[PDB]
Design a protein around this ligand. Sequence first.
Ligand SMILES: C=C(C)[C@@H]1CC[C@]2(C(=O)O)CC[C@]3(C)[C@H](CC[C@@H]4[C@@]5(C)CC[C@H](OC(=O)CC(C)(C)C(=O)O)C(C)(C)[C@@H]5CC[C@]43C)[C@@H]12
Lengths: 228, 228, 228, 228, 228
Amino acid sequence: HQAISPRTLNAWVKVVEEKAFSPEVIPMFSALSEGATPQDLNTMLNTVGGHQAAMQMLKETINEEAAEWDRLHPVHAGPIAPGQMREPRGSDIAGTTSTLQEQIGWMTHNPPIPVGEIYKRWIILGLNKIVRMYSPTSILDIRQGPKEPFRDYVDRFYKTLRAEQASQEVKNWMTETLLVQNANPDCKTILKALGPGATLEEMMTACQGVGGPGHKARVIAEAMSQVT
Amino acid sequence: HQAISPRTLNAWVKVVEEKAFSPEVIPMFSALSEGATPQDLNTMLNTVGGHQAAMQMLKETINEEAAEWDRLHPVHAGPIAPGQMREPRGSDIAGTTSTLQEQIGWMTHNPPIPVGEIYKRWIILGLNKIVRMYSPTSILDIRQGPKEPFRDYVDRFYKTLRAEQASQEVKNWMTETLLVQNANPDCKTILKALGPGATLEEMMTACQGVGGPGHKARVIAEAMSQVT
Amino acid sequence: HQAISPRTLNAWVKVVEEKAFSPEVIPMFSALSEGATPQDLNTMLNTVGGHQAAMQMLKETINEEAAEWDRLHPVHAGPIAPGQMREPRGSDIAGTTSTLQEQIGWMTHNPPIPVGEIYKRWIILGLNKIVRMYSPTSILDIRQGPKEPFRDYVDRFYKTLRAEQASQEVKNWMTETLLVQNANPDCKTILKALGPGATLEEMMTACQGVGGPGHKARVIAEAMSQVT
Amino acid sequence: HQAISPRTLNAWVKVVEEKAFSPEVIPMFSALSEGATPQDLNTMLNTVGGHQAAMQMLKETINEEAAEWDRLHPVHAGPIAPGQMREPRGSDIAGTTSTLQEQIGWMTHNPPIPVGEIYKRWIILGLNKIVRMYSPTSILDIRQGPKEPFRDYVDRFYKTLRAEQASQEVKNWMTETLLVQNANPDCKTILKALGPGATLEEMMTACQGVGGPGHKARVIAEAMSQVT
Amino acid sequence: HQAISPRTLNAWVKVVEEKAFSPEVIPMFSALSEGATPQDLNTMLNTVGGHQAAMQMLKETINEEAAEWDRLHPVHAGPIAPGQMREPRGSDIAGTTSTLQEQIGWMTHNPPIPVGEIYKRWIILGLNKIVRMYSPTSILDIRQGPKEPFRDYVDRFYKTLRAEQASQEVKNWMTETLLVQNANPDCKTILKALGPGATLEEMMTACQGVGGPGHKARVIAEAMSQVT
Ligand SMILES: C=C(C)[C@@H]1CC[C@]2(C(=O)O)CC[C@]3(C)[C@H](CC[C@@H]4[C@@]5(C)CC[C@H](OC(=O)CC(C)(C)C(=O)O)C(C)(C)[C@@H]5CC[C@]43C)[C@@H]12
């Protein structure tokens, strides 16, 4: 049997990262998965890096459809007759407790039990649910809350950037611009009043006092003096 | 033998989606599953999307009624009758344990044990409880809290919007109007200060200030100046 | 043989409803259906609710391709063939004049005559034409014509709104806002002169005179007063 | 066999005429007709007076479901049937082809064929379509169009009044009230200028020339005089 | 036998959509189709997309020529002729009631019956009538009538645009630059007074009032003020 080529896996993971589970991933997933055994489907699903929420949703959908298949399709009791073997359970279709040899036997037997296409249908349902209900996070969509500490947002921004898929120079440029650009107006004002090019430690120290008693009293004083 | 059809099941899910678990769903259900085997009832009940809380309540009702049936109706001592007939335990009425063939045999046996009717009654009780206490959520119910950050409110708004059953055009229109309509007065005045047609990122950048020390000082000073 | 399942069919109906015959339905149809007998895609198409014009265009396309298939493939000589059953026609590939046993025999015969794949291709062409040409209707597209009386406007608005797929609360909200949001400047002026919270009957009564001699005289007199 | 009874049928007609295909007619239909042969439900549907569009939609849905049943369930090969009677079809389940004896034989066979329940399910789907789509017409809904001549408005009013089910004194009261209560501002003004108690012929004579050159010129001149 | 090839058929389709039934299509049809069996020209004519009126006229011409051929050539006596196969008929030359084997046998016989050239002559006559009479519809021909409401104008404009042969970017440019260019002086001046870059919905809202009592009164009063 023909397994999944490494170039196929690379293309699948690349489209996964590039489209960020856009609807355009639904067609692509079909195109490179035609005639694929459920073990190959599981391998092609596992290599997707990141997007843990999407993987959780897809696994939940797979489990739901496997349970439905188990309920609708019963099992046969008794010794297995020669010329045949065990009927595919829901997990067998999902490729969790079915060996590759058994899956290939199911596909190539006459009449053929389409374990691969049923599994692909379950994964397609999961992917449709994902593209309907999943909104990817990005370094552009992480900002600082009105009362959130500056240090905590710096740590969260660094974690999100470390989770990003981009070149090192691009990430450094994003650190240079977005950090000051996307911040609490108080934190942004403190950073902008400070000279550009200040180190991260200095910009954290300058914003370490944001939200404290002294800063609140000072800003109240400025507001009261300005209005009056 | 008799089995459910795609048309009736589609109509059932459509009426469930249309009326948000209103009382009008109790008759229609009982009007669609007449003479239905428990497996057909389970398939009818598991196909409704959304309303996870209501479905959880209905399920819990099913388990409690199955436990009551098991308590009231005892099981045999263990030996099997020469007629090869098994008394239906509480679990298998709901279809979790028994298969389609066993349910059909029970429903066709003389005298008939209408397991489908008992399961339908249990599901009816669950639906009655659902309409009694459970209330579905809606996009119009999403309102920004008094101390809520704008980013979290937008996240909640879009999370509820994605699961809502509607078309893309109406969804975009609701995004355009409701999101700025339902907002904190502090957030709403800032949004109204911005001209119409401002993008979502501009809205969030403008509203990032509310609840922070600077915004609080500004509103306090403005109110003090206006009063005196 | 494994036929369609309620989950996949319901997902197909849901994706059709959510995206009103957007291009994204072309791959999903190619993904949910695989190895499906012509009766299976017939069920897959019939359960689609609404979009009667689109379904009519799809049916016309299927008739066109069936006629072309009949034209290109003639009747084999010999009405009786003990070796193998009859050859497919244009209509029975579409499933109108075929039984499930015959379709299964065709798709399983050696060599295979994939009536399912050919029918799927015909429906794919139909959906491509649909997404190329058909424009879905929506409640926001309902707008009062300049000379349209308010009563027929309201009748059309409620007809499309009731044909719309949504919830009761959001439908009531649409009735509250869009009815006066989409109206002629004369009817809009009359309704704005009415205080907010006026009933539908009050609004219909207030706009009964739009287009009559009394209105067409009063507006002209007001304009003459304004410009003189 | 116990067929339908005059009390249940009369109550069915009464409830349909009372709530006018409100959702509350869905349970009663499933309540007043249980165990009914398809001829009984055919009689139940035929005796309904009025609501021609509703019955149009209902029986259209009935033919749709019958065609779907014919598609899914094929004619059994071999006209010979010595052991038992013929298998049902869509039309002969809907009652338009089978006889009462055949329906009774099916509904009491071993195993039974629930012809009555299937037909009741089809009528239930049709009734749900009615209550979702059909809006009853009422005398209070008759309003004169802005450019509609008074004679045709009166003709429409009296046509729907005759179609209305009420008492003669009640109908006379509706004639006395709604005729002048539902009219264009021009016709309303003309009628109010007429003294109360004017006959219908005098009322029609007074509004015979609304929309003619003389009336339009008179109202335009009055508006000009008021403005200047 | 050498049937038609995809390249020539695609070229024929391309020239038809390029010059839109200009006279230059008459030679190409006689050049691409040489020695073609009637089935080949039937395929050549069916693949033509658009120009439904022109194809209907061509079908009418073919029917007329077939009727004339049947009139001038009678059906020879003798139900069965062992010496030679049957003689052609009017509808048979068009390929409606003939198979490819029969057409090949006729076009290759001693003496030959040139069914292909006769059918080609009929299609050439039809094409000549088409190029003489039929005028293709284009997007530039869509102009809104003096009394046409703007909404139906936009509907017609998009309906004809959606059937064009252009690309997406040029289609968007044509929407941007042609909708306002082809409009009534009233609608055009409303759109010019309205700021450039306004959305389609804003434009439709602006021109919703054209043709109503308020707009007519306003323009009449403006003209009266101008000339007095
Ligand atoms: C008495 C007055 C106070 C003033 C003092 C003298 C006057 C002036 O100096 O102003 C001379 C001009 C007139 C007479 C006005 C009165 C009004 C009229 C009128 C506004 C009347 C309504 C008519 O409109 C129609 O015909 C309606 C329409 C839809 C077009 C249809 O049915 O065809 C038109 C033709 C538009 C005229 C124009 C001429 C003027 C201005 C006079």
